[PDB]
Design a protein around this motif. Structure first.
Motif, mmCIF file in Angstrom:
data_model
loop_
_atom_site.group_PDB
_atom_site.id
_atom_site.type_symbol
_atom_site.label_atom_id
_atom_site.label_comp_id
_atom_site.label_asym_id
_atom_site.label_seq_id
_atom_site.Cartn_x
_atom_site.Cartn_y
_atom_site.Cartn_z
ATOM 1 N N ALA A 47 0.831 -1.194 0.000
ATOM 2 C CA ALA A 47 0.000 0.000 0.000
ATOM 3 C C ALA A 47 0.870 1.251 0.000
ATOM 4 O O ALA A 47 2.005 1.245 0.481
ATOM 5 N N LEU A 48 0.323 2.330 -0.542
ATOM 6 C CA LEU A 48 1.126 3.512 -0.810
ATOM 7 C C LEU A 48 1.541 4.194 0.491
ATOM 8 O O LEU A 48 0.687 4.515 1.325
ATOM 9 N N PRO A 49 2.836 4.413 0.703
ATOM 10 C CA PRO A 49 3.286 5.209 1.847
ATOM 11 C C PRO A 49 3.433 6.673 1.483
ATOM 12 O O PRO A 49 3.107 7.071 0.361
ATOM 13 N N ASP A 50 3.922 7.487 2.413
ATOM 14 C CA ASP A 50 4.286 8.854 2.070
ATOM 15 C C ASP A 50 5.641 8.881 1.373
ATOM 16 O O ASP A 50 6.613 8.284 1.843
ATOM 17 N N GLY A 51 5.702 9.586 0.245
ATOM 18 C CA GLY A 51 6.923 9.704 -0.520
ATOM 19 C C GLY A 51 7.073 8.717 -1.658
ATOM 20 O O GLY A 51 8.078 8.778 -2.376
ATOM 21 N N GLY A 52 6.113 7.814 -1.849
ATOM 22 C CA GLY A 52 6.219 6.849 -2.918
ATOM 23 C C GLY A 52 5.615 7.344 -4.215
ATOM 24 O O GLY A 52 4.964 8.385 -4.275
ATOM 25 N N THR A 53 5.847 6.576 -5.276
ATOM 26 C CA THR A 53 5.255 6.851 -6.576
ATOM 27 C C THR A 53 4.242 5.767 -6.890
ATOM 28 O O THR A 53 4.624 4.594 -6.998
ATOM 29 N N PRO A 54 2.965 6.095 -7.046
ATOM 30 C CA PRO A 54 1.965 5.055 -7.298
ATOM 31 C C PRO A 54 2.220 4.366 -8.623
ATOM 32 O O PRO A 54 2.697 4.974 -9.581
ATOM 33 N N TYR A 55 1.907 3.078 -8.667
ATOM 34 C CA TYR A 55 2.097 2.289 -9.874
ATOM 35 C C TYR A 55 0.799 1.819 -10.506
ATOM 36 O O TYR A 55 0.722 1.734 -11.731
ATOM 37 N N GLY A 56 -0.220 1.530 -9.706
ATOM 38 C CA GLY A 56 -1.478 1.032 -10.227
ATOM 39 C C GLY A 56 -2.508 1.039 -9.125
ATOM 40 O O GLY A 56 -2.285 1.586 -8.045
ATOM 41 N N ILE A 57 -3.648 0.417 -9.405
ATOM 42 C CA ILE A 57 -4.774 0.392 -8.480
ATOM 43 C C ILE A 57 -5.271 -1.039 -8.359
ATOM 44 O O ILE A 57 -5.475 -1.714 -9.371
ATOM 45 N N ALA A 58 -5.457 -1.497 -7.124
ATOM 46 C CA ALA A 58 -5.920 -2.859 -6.891
ATOM 47 C C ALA A 58 -7.283 -3.079 -7.529
ATOM 48 O O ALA A 58 -8.131 -2.186 -7.548
ATOM 49 N N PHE A 59 -7.494 -4.281 -8.045
ATOM 50 C CA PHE A 59 -8.622 -4.591 -8.908
ATOM 51 C C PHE A 59 -9.462 -5.689 -8.272
ATOM 52 O O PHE A 59 -8.927 -6.612 -7.655
ATOM 53 N N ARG A 60 -10.778 -5.580 -8.420
ATOM 54 C CA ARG A 60 -11.695 -6.465 -7.716
ATOM 55 C C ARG A 60 -11.893 -7.770 -8.474
ATOM 56 O O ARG A 60 -12.198 -7.768 -9.668
ATOM 57 N N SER A 61 -11.738 -8.889 -7.773
ATOM 58 C CA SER A 61 -11.950 -10.205 -8.353
ATOM 59 C C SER A 61 -12.649 -11.090 -7.335
ATOM 60 O O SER A 61 -12.374 -11.014 -6.137
ATOM 61 N N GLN A 62 -13.548 -11.939 -7.820
ATOM 62 C CA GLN A 62 -14.391 -12.736 -6.945
ATOM 63 C C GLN A 62 -13.935 -14.179 -6.821
ATOM 64 O O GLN A 62 -14.658 -14.993 -6.245
ATOM 65 N N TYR A 63 -12.764 -14.518 -7.344
ATOM 66 C CA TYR A 63 -12.156 -15.820 -7.128
ATOM 67 C C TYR A 63 -10.844 -15.717 -6.373
ATOM 68 O O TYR A 63 -10.568 -16.531 -5.490
ATOM 69 N N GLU A 64 -10.030 -14.713 -6.692
ATOM 70 C CA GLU A 64 -8.710 -14.607 -6.084
ATOM 71 C C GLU A 64 -8.797 -14.160 -4.635
ATOM 72 O O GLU A 64 -7.975 -14.560 -3.805
ATOM 73 N N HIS A 65 -9.780 -13.329 -4.311
ATOM 74 C CA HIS A 65 -9.893 -12.708 -2.995
ATOM 75 C C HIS A 65 -11.261 -13.041 -2.417
ATOM 76 O O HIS A 65 -12.230 -12.306 -2.616
ATOM 77 N N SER A 107 -2.012 9.353 1.988
ATOM 78 C CA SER A 107 -1.504 8.101 2.528
ATOM 79 C C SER A 107 -2.574 7.016 2.484
ATOM 80 O O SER A 107 -3.769 7.279 2.644
ATOM 81 N N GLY A 108 -2.129 5.781 2.270
ATOM 82 C CA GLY A 108 -3.036 4.663 2.127
ATOM 83 C C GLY A 108 -3.603 4.480 0.740
ATOM 84 O O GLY A 108 -4.412 3.568 0.533
ATOM 85 N N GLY A 109 -3.205 5.310 -0.217
ATOM 86 C CA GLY A 109 -3.704 5.199 -1.569
ATOM 87 C C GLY A 109 -5.117 5.707 -1.739
ATOM 88 O O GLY A 109 -5.954 5.032 -2.342
ATOM 89 N N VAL A 110 -5.403 6.889 -1.212
ATOM 90 C CA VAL A 110 -6.695 7.530 -1.402
ATOM 91 C C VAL A 110 -6.467 8.857 -2.106
ATOM 92 O O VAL A 110 -5.419 9.492 -1.953
#
Lengths: 53, 150, 53, 156, 373, 382
Positions: free
Chosen positions: B52-70, B109-112
């Motif tokens: 999850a994104l901390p302070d000072g990082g560079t975001p790479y992508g966004i978590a994606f919803r799946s109904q089998y993996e999670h 922070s937290g990717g919001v």
């Protein structure tokens, strides 16, 4: 020896669309490609292409 | 010659069928929630380790919803994870009102999403709805937009 | 160790298979998948590992 | 008098070989001009024909701007110096977007997500003088005496 | 609205109305007269096994209003040149309306064939070149009758059976069913009056807890349960509405569907009348009447186009077996009646054994017989 | 928004079928009758040994379930192995051998080889099939002669070419959601029955107590206790100033007719009629179920001619050694002792009532008598 090619686009709505008389739009778009290929062959014969040697 | 829309409008899922890219060879360190930005902390054997994104990082992508993996409801440590790297996606936000169309978003922070005045990065796509006494926005993610600082 | 499936196992739920080719402009893309779990030791203490040999 | 078994691993990369089946885009309407290029090297565009439409490309030199990287092809490439190249006056397969393995001249692993810098001969280098907008994709390997790096490119 | 393919492959009613007639029509069978024997005819017929092609050919002919079939003959000539007389073929295949076009036009004064196209171009696709076909190898099947002032606009081709009237008749039925489901859902409502409920600001834990309490309370209401209220502050009432006539309305819609279709209820609704025991026989014979009446106009030309390529015998006739469901007891009794009719009184005149036997197995019996005297 | 590994229509239709019983019936109630009806073969010297081979091979359940998945999944594959000294990839020379038969669903079969030679009329069809069952067995290759592909229903060619020349499921979306709406309406009906009557009790001050308190717990416990004991023969007392007790009620009507209309739609959209899908006789008439069943047999025969027979000419030539034969189907009609007694007496008197004066001799009279299947045994002889 060289290779040639092109493509064409058509949508389902225009496939649906009808006309009073005349060849269908898909057939005309398919004939245009053949004509373009033949014209390019003639142009290659009678004019050449410097970058392609 | 048009692009179809995608009906369920929940956080963590894709909103359109435009050009998108899903990076499915990843693993998680810590816990991640659907609809949050993630960062790449390392690479092992062609696999990207994300957190999850901390302070000072560079975001790479966004978590994606799946109904089998999670099956739990969120992504758990040591799980294979889906990450969206290019496309339009619904993100969690702490904002109160919609920002200007096509502005530049900023991630707290937290990717919001908390800012709409960034210099460069991802852009607002025009969607703004309400979730759980909180809101959901629509972001347009592009592949090389955020570049890791030297 | 003692070789008996009641003690340790490796399981392959799905074998190797090739998906149908997806065509693009002038090429194809052929994906393949499989499933595996690794080594599961149900009954330990039946395996002795001598190290530093 | 006991039996034996042995285990060997294949290599994982080749110069100019496409990293995966993610987003990519290939330009095939180009023609090489004034020399030959190396599979897995950056190329530059001299001019674009207004009516014909074919682009003219050559190997990267000093003071130029990269456009793409030539990729592998078992049919369009000719074999010289024990490697595949594109000889003059022939169609070329340039890559304009996606992940690809490029020849490198560096000696240490790069940083994921950082910008890419090249040499004056179209080979990546950790401290090159030519600056691009492509990124490192994380991959870093080595064939037999050949150093390869995985680079991600976007449309110019 | 116009994409008939979706209507065909999505709604089952369109599937039935376009498919039920031709397949039963062809599976009914036919007989030929003027032939030495029928065993070899049936053997060659079911060895060639072209009836799936005939079925779906007639199907797209009905649906799209036009289709073509080509039969390839065992001949040592190019497929453009015409045919010499003969009885050969090795394959039959069908193309839909869109792949067929006229190529060259013959309008000569001498031939009555002027205005009948001579050469066709066919473009199947499947990365094979379109080719040219002489008329004598192909038979074009059209749809139904239409005025010339649209026949010549539709390039001499028929019309689809799915006219806009039938289309919207099918369409509004689902609308009616959806409305019926909605009316059933909206039978009764409960209202909970709470003064000051509007004063709460939204997206708050207060109203979240309030609606959670509403869930808890309404989930457990019923006959053996009571709910307490406060008289001064809030009240709870229930209103209701009735439903009636919806089945009759839906039945009327279905009746309109059948009437605009032209094939009746024992075939469309698949529901017996129930109140009468012996009227379905007349209903089915009326259906048989209509199917034979339509069969005579289209199915026969296929037969006289195809048979002259299999039969070497000179002159023949075709008869359509009366499409009725036979039955053991009744067929046993009719065989009794026919066998006594054929030789009850013939023993006294010149009608002899050789013609009597011909008569008695001219009618298809369950009684076999070896050929001979 | 789809997974690449394999399609999901498989899971959808499979789960729906194995879950809902109406799905069981609608997709199984045809094929088993179609196959168990039986058939006869003519041009053969005898039928006792034919039946002996048939029931010694006993592949009928395999055929049943093969046609079952052909109907359901839109495609199925059946393979018979032959007794020959050649590799299974090689073609099959003429002969009468067979020793095993087995069936796969739609998902285990793919195309390998295609030829478009102008000489043959066979160009454009799968020459070789790749079969990949799984079960840790390597996919292998089978010649065209050994595989029969059972298809479902015809579709438009523009979709047939998109679906690699393979049909669609019998459960289209209209049928699926028509079935689905039934359960929702049933639950609504149960709710309507539950909410027929409601009792309310109002007492000034009940709003004053705040939540999760012993006084409120005692009050609601007393409410439940008293509501348990009320009834016709018992009375409940209240206070005039501070309490009121009201009751509300609603009517129910038309619900059975609404459900009957829903079932009418289901049966009409399915195509199999009421006394076989709803499984209830009309009751108001004595002899209309006879015409209902004869229409049912008419439809099963009209479809059966189009699918069952191809199995017959695919499999029989591998077991029948004779040159020529014919296949006939039993008329789908339940016989009965009585009626079979009269029909057999009529046939036996018709076969020899008037033949005594013609050249019709005993050698063909016996053949005629025992061709129409009698209960009168007769060994071969003169």
């Amino acid at each position: 020896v060289f290779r040639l090619g092109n493509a064409y686009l058509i949508s389902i709505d225009e496939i649906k669309a009808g006309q009073a008389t005349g060849r269908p739009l898909s057939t005309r778009k398919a004939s245009a490609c053949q004509l373009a290929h033949d014209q390019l062959v003639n142009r290659l014969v009678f004019k050449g292409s410097a970058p392609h040697k | 010659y048009e692009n179809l829309f995608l009906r369920p409008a929940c956080p963590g899922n894709i909103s359109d069928t435009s050009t998108y890219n899903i990076d499915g060879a990843c693993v998680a360190q810590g816990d991640i929630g659907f609809g949050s930005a993630v960062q790449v902390v390392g690479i092992v054997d062609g696999v990207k380790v994300v957190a999850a994104l901390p302070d000072g990082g560079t975001p790479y992508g966004i978590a994606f919803r799946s109904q089998y993996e999670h099956l739990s409801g969120k992504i758990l440590d040591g799980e294979v994870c889906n990450v969206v790297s290019h496309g339009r996606v619904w993100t969690l936000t702490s904002l109160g009102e919609a920002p200007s169309l096509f502005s530049k978003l900023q991630f707290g922070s937290g990717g919001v999403v908390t800012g709409g005045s960034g210099s460069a990065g991802w852009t607002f796509a025009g969607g703004f709805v309400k979730h759980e006494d909180g809101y959901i926005i629509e972001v347009q993610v592009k592949q090389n937009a955020f570049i890791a600082p030297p | 160790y003692e070789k008996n499936p009641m003690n340790m196992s490796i399981e392959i739920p799905e074998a190797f298979n090739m998906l149908p080719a997806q065509p693009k402009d002038l090429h194809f893309k052929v994906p393949c998948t499989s499933k595996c779990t690794g080594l599961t030791i149900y009954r330990p203490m039946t395996i002795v590992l001598i190290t530093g040999v | 008098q006991i039996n034996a078994s042995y285990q060997r691993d294949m290599a994982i990369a080749l110069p100019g070989m496409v990293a995966d089946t993610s987003k990519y885009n290939i330009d095939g309407a180009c023609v090489v001009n004034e020399g030959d290029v190396l599979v897995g090297a950056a190329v530059q565009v001299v001019q674009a024909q207004a009516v014909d439409g074919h682009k003219l490309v050559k190997a990267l030199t000093t003071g130029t701007t990269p456009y793409g990287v030539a990729i592998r092809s078992h049919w369009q490439t000719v074999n010289a110096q024990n490697q595949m190249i594109y000889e003059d006056g022939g169609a070329i397969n340039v890559m304009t977007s996606g992940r690809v393995w490029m020849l490198s001249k560096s000696t240490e692993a790069p940083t994921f997500g950082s910008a890419v810098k090249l040499d004056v001969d179209g080979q990546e280098k950790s401290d090159g003088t030519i600056e691009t907008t492509w990124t490192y994709a994380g991959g870093w390997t080595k064939y037999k005496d050949i150093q390869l790096v995985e680079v991600q490119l976007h449309q110019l | 609205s116009y994409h008939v393919g979706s209507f065909y492959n999505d709604n089952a009613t369109a599937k039935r109305i376009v498919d039920v007639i031709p397949e039963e029509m062809v599976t009914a069978g036919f007989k030929i007269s003027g032939v030495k024997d029928e065993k070899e005819f049936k053997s060659l017929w079911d060895s060639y096994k072209i009836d799936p092609s005939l079925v779906d050919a007639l199907c797209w002919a009905r649906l799209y209003g036009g289709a073509a079939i080509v039969a390839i003959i065992n001949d040592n000539r190019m497929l453009t040149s015409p045919v010499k007389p003969g009885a050969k073929l090795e394959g039959v295949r069908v193309y839909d309306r869109f792949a067929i076009t006229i190529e060259k036009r013959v309008t000569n004064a001498r031939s009555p064939r002027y205005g009948e196209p001579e050469i066709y171009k066919v473009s199947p696709g499947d990365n094979i070149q379109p080719y040219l076909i002489h008329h004598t190898r192909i038979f074009i099947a059209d749809g139904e009758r239409v005025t010339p002032q649209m026949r010549k606009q539709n390039q001499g081709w028929g019309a689809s059976v799915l006219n806009k009237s039938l289309i919207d008749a099918i369409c509004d039925y689902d609308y009616c069913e959806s409305l019926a489901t909605q009316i059933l859902r909206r039978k009764q409502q409960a209202v909970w009056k709470v003064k000051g409920l509007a004063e709460m600001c939204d997206d708050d834990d207060a109203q979240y807890a309030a609606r959670l309490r509403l869930a808890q309370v309404d989930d457990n209401s019923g006959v053996g349960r009571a709910i307490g209220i406060d008289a001064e502050t809030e009240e709870y009432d229930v209103l209701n509405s009735d439903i009636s006539g919806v089945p009759e309305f839906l039945s009327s819609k279905m009746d309109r569907i059948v009437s605009l279709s032209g094939i009746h209820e024992i075939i469309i609704k698949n529901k017996n009348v129930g109140g009468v025991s012996a009227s379905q026989n007349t209903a089915l014979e009326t259906f048989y009447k209509l199917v034979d009446r339509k069969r005579e106009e289209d199915y026969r030309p296929l037969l006289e186009f195809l048979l002259p390529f299999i039969v070497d015998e000179q002159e023949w006739s075709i008869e359509f077996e009366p499409l009725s469901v036979p039955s053991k007891k009744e067929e046993s009794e009719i065989t009794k009646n026919n066998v006594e009719s054929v030789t009850k009184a013939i023993t006294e005149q010149i009608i002899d054994l050789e013609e009597a036997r011909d008569t008695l197995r001219s009618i298809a019996p369950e009684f076999k017989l070896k050929d001979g005297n």
